[PDB]
Design a protein around this ligand. Structure first.
Ligand SMILES: Nc1ccc2c(c1)c(-c1ccccc1)[n+](CCCCCc1cnnn1CCNc1c3c(nc4ccccc14)CCCC3)c1cc(N)ccc21
Ligand SMILES: Nc1ccc2c(c1)c(-c1ccccc1)[n+](CCCCCc1cnnn1CCNc1c3c(nc4ccccc14)CCCC3)c1cc(N)ccc21
Ligand SMILES: *[C@@H]1O[C@H](CO)[C@@H](O)[C@H](O)[C@H]1NC(C)=O
Ligand SMILES: *[C@@H]1O[C@H](CO)[C@@H](O)[C@H](O)[C@H]1NC(C)=O
Ligand SMILES: *[C@@H]1O[C@H](CO)[C@@H](O)[C@H](O)[C@H]1NC(C)=O
Lengths: 538, 534
């Protein structure tokens, strides 16, 4: 110390850090990357709840992103930006419990609202180090303090033998909770306001945010929440204790650890990380899409009951939530698992391929339930039209997994005292490499919220730059006040809260805010009210 | 005498009456006997042909109306009383009426045979709405309408017995069709061009003549207005007809089929009418006690089996519905409904209504109906719930059976033309909420707005004339389009692919596609699976 930039030296509970001065389009930002928030969850600590990071000596170098949690790397389309933008961009390691902080440069004078990002990737993948999660634009343009953490995914984060002490499950959610506790204790050192913390996430990250709303020890660590294209309720975000036990026992057998829980988990702990990753997909009970093997478990601890029970009986009076979906939630999910679909052709499918797709897309559905889906989604005026069947297949997967769980969440939260704001993101990035038929796929609003179009080198349009700026203002005004609307602006139309009566939501596209009523009201009544009765009475 | 009013039919001489229609005279031959009176020992028995007569038979007045239940729900109310018997009630009722141009046609003229509705428990060919004088005068048509036995008298069956075989009301209709073949040439009608047309139970009757081979040689074309042979109310199984006939016998104190039917034959007609409604298996609406039975004789199989397996090539069919098929049916049986208020109902009253409106439905099937018909944007809105209740009853009973019929007929070689009648008569005394109720297109097809004394608008007179042209163009050629009108829009045939139908209102023909395609997929494809697997 002495010749360094005095504005990049900060102390936290565990010791001294040295950050880096990053260039954002409009000026510098301070970034503290790869801060350890936990003891590496390696060896005997595998499958175990995280432990806080013991203090270190000297100045920890926080200028680069740290290891990405051990996960399956997507090699389906080599060289393809469409798939590779989501791939790990740092070394894979079980030693991965690190977080990143972006703040204005110089650090804020007065306490600043904090935004905490929780990434998606079906609870089997993802990293806080990805380019689309770059906090520099929100920090520079909006003066925000942005935090993102790495949390354990796959078997490492969610393999559970419920009731055991060695593998209790939900440890990836505990890693997220420990980063939330780290923020409470240390964010003031960066100029962050611990009394104004907004959680935001997409897909499995939004489901994670939802589970922090539904778990009491997490409630004291944040004040507001954003759930983008994901919810704690729904068919993929959780599993029962029985199903988690079945999947963990099957994976153990597949890697030569046959079953006492102590003996089984000890053997799993001896397995190389790649062995567990090589078999993680082999434990799913059916041929399915939008289903992940190791996800949060209804343990009766982190989740005292199913998210459906918790959202229906909870008092959400003290909560402000921003929720929404993209135009084509299911389109991407069709390219791996449904025969007839490809990113390289127009995916015009037959009726037979549609019926078959419905079985893969709704794996838990009986023959009667699958017929009810088919009959509801068929255009009886053009029942064999390949374009309609292709679009219906995308809608089945999007509605079942995202849109209707989101409508169910917004509805219950609003009925139970929360301030809810809902949107539909309909803008397709001019730079998108997925086919046009895929529309606005799952995750393609993220680069807009984070302000990536503000970087001139990324080649987005001027209109896309103005729209990203509008979006950053909605998200940060929501983080600041619990309302996305700017108080010093009446010209711009307003975003009304979502209510059970009016069911108002807004369209997020290049045009000004447009207020719409009912988020697939008829279709989601099918999924949320009828279909459970068909998967119950018969 | 007037030679234009003197006709010799196979049974003897008749004398008609010259009637005044707005545009000029018409010849009417009313109350022609086509069968031996089905009285005494002939009660419940198939009709027998009328024996010949001496002298000139007086055919100047309508004859007796078949014994039936008279509607007294709203006394003095035109809305209900227009459908009530307008002649004396008698079991001696097997008579038909003929209207022809005056003077009698020079060349053989296409024949239109009207079969009235009234849930197979009521109706008469003598009602003012069925007046053939306008079609005869304006279009030069030969119009025939017969009385057929309704209620227990027409459809009480002890299947397998010889004394009460069932479907005798359909046999009465068939005997009038045979009478037309043998005698219509004497009036200037063409027996080689006979179109059956009917509404509600009359349209279901027309449908059953399409599905029964001995009837097929008696007509060439058919019009089914707001009714079909398929569907939940038009037929009953042999087991259910036997159950209902046994229960009715019990209710009138009647203790072997021969012995039971003999006792029923001793009962005054009113005793049978007094208990006919008390044999229905549930609290229901749009359900009638004594209707055609699947006997394995007149109906060789269920109308659903027959429509799915039949060859309908060399057949032309005109089918359609009114805008608000179910609205009227809510006024009797559904709590919360009245003709005297706006009938704004609660959600509870809607769920309860769905049970009465779909009586065969399980708890799951009723929930599926409720969830499909609820507007999840306004689920408690009384106006939406009222309109949804009307749509449930209209769709279940009429619109979706019509869509199922049009589809199967078209797929199996018939030439089908479909419509939706959306014009509400300026003279309607039913509330506005009821829209265009079941049966209120009939006065337009028959040309009643052409009578200046009936106070319809000028636009309604022009529209009735358009409708009479569609119906008679269809009777003449099997195509309702005007070969004269070299200007469109043309009425396209209904196909399984394109599903084209037309709107019949004051505006020019408008071609639409899919007759409640999504909703009728629910009723015709999904709901049977919910009452089959569970
Ligand atoms: N060897 C083997 C054995 C069996 C199976 C598989 C591989 C794979 C596989 C194939 C290619 C790449 C990755 C996994 N999948 C397909 C899994 C499909 C899930 C895709 C998904 C769901 N959430 N994140 N991802 C992948 C991460 N990438 C994305 C992410 C997001 N959006 C995206 C939009 C387009 C393209 C990728 C996106 C938003 C959230 C961040 C992650 C399976 C699916 C099933 N159901 C069963 C077995 C396998
Ligand atoms: N005493 C007693 C005991 C139990 C029950 C009943 C009476 C009555 C009843 C009440 C008034 C008049 C006749 C019957 N109904 C209601 C049945 C009403 C059937 C409605 C119907 C169906 N087809 N014809 N009609 C009556 C005739 N009138 C009409 C007709 C048509 N359209 C109409 C439009 C508006 C009003 C009346 C119309 C077109 C075809 C001609 C007949 C019951 C209904 C049920 N489901 C169960 C028991 C009874
Ligand atoms: C698209 O490509 C896939 C894989 O090659 C194939 O299954 C599908 O039939 C193709 N569809 C079209 C429309 O060419
Ligand atoms: C931007 O466009 C230029 C062409 O002018 C191209 O060379 C560069 O690779 C593009 N970069 C991105 C990120 O699209
Ligand atoms: C309509 O009137 C009947 C009785 O005449 C009643 O049961 C019903 O509640 C009334 N509805 C309204 C909207 O007042």
């Amino acid at each position: 110390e002495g010749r360094e930039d005095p504005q990049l030296l900060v102390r936290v509970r565990g010791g001294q850090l040295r950050g880096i001065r990053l260039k954002a389009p409009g000026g510098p930002v301070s970034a503290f990357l790869g801060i350890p928030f936990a003891e590496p969850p390696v060896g005997s600590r595998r499958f175990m709840p995280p432990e806080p990071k013991r203090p270190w000596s000297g100045v920890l170098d926080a200028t680069t992103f740290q290891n990405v949690c051990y996960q399956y790397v997507d090699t389906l389309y080599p060289g393809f930006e469409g798939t590779e933008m989501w791939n790990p961009n740092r070394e894979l390691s079980e030693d991965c419990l690190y977080l990143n902080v972006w703040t204005p440069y110089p650090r804020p004078a007065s306490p600043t609202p904090v935004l905490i990002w929780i990434y998606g990737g079906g609870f089997y993948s993802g990293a806080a180090s990805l380019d689309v999660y770059d906090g520099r634009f929100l920090a520079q343009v909006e003066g925000a303090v942005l935090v993102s953490m790495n949390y354990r995914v796959g078997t490492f984060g969610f393999l559970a033998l419920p009731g055991s002490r060695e593998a209790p499950g939900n440890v990836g959610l505990l890693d997220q909770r420990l980063a939330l506790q780290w923020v409470q204790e240390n964010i003031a050192a960066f100029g962050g306001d611990p009394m104004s913390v907004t959680l935001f996430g997409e897909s499995a990250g939004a489901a994670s945010v939802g589970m922090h709303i539904l778990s009491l020890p997490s409630r004291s660590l944040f004040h507001r929440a954003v759930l983008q294209s994901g919810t704690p309720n729904g068919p993929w975000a959780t599993v029962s204790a029985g199903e988690a036990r079945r999947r963990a026992t099957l994976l153990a057998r597949l890697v030569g650890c046959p079953p006492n829980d102590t003996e089984l988990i000890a053997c799993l702990r001896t397995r190389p990380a790649q062995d567990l990753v090589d078999h993680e997909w082999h434990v799913l009970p059916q041929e399915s899409i939008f289903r992940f093997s190791f996800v949060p478990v209804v343990d009766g601890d982190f989740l005292s009951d199913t998210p459906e029970a918790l959202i229906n009986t909870g008092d959400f009076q003290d909560l402000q939530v921003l929720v929404g979906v993209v135009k084509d939630e299911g389109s991407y999910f069709l390219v791996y698992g449904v025969p007839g679909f490809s990113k390289d052709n127009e995916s015009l499918i037959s009726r037979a391929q549609f019926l078959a797709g419905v079985r893969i897309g709704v794996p838990q559905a009986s023959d009667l339930a699958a017929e009810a889906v088919v009959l509801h989604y068929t255009d009886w005026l053009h029942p064999e039209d390949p374009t309609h069947l292709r679009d219906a297949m995308s809608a089945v997967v999007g509605d079942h997994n995202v849109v209707c769980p989101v409508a169910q969440l917004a509805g219950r939260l609003a009925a139970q005292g929360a301030r809810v704001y809902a949107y539909i993101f309909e803008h397709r990035a001019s730079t998108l490499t997925w086919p046009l038929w895929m529309g606005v796929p799952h995750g393609y609003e993220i680069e807009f919220i984070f302000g990536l179009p503000l970087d001139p080198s990324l080649n987005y349009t001027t209109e896309e730059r103005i729209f990203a700026q509008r979006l950053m203002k909605y998200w940060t005004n929501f983080a600041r006040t619990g309302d996305p609307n700017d108080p010093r602006d009446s010209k711009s139309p307003q975003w009304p809260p979502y209510t059970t009566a009016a069911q108002q939501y807004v369209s997020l596209n290049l045009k000004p805010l447009e207020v719409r009523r009912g988020l697939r009201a008829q279709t989601c009544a099918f999924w949320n009210r009828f279909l459970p009765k068909l998967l119950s009475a018969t």
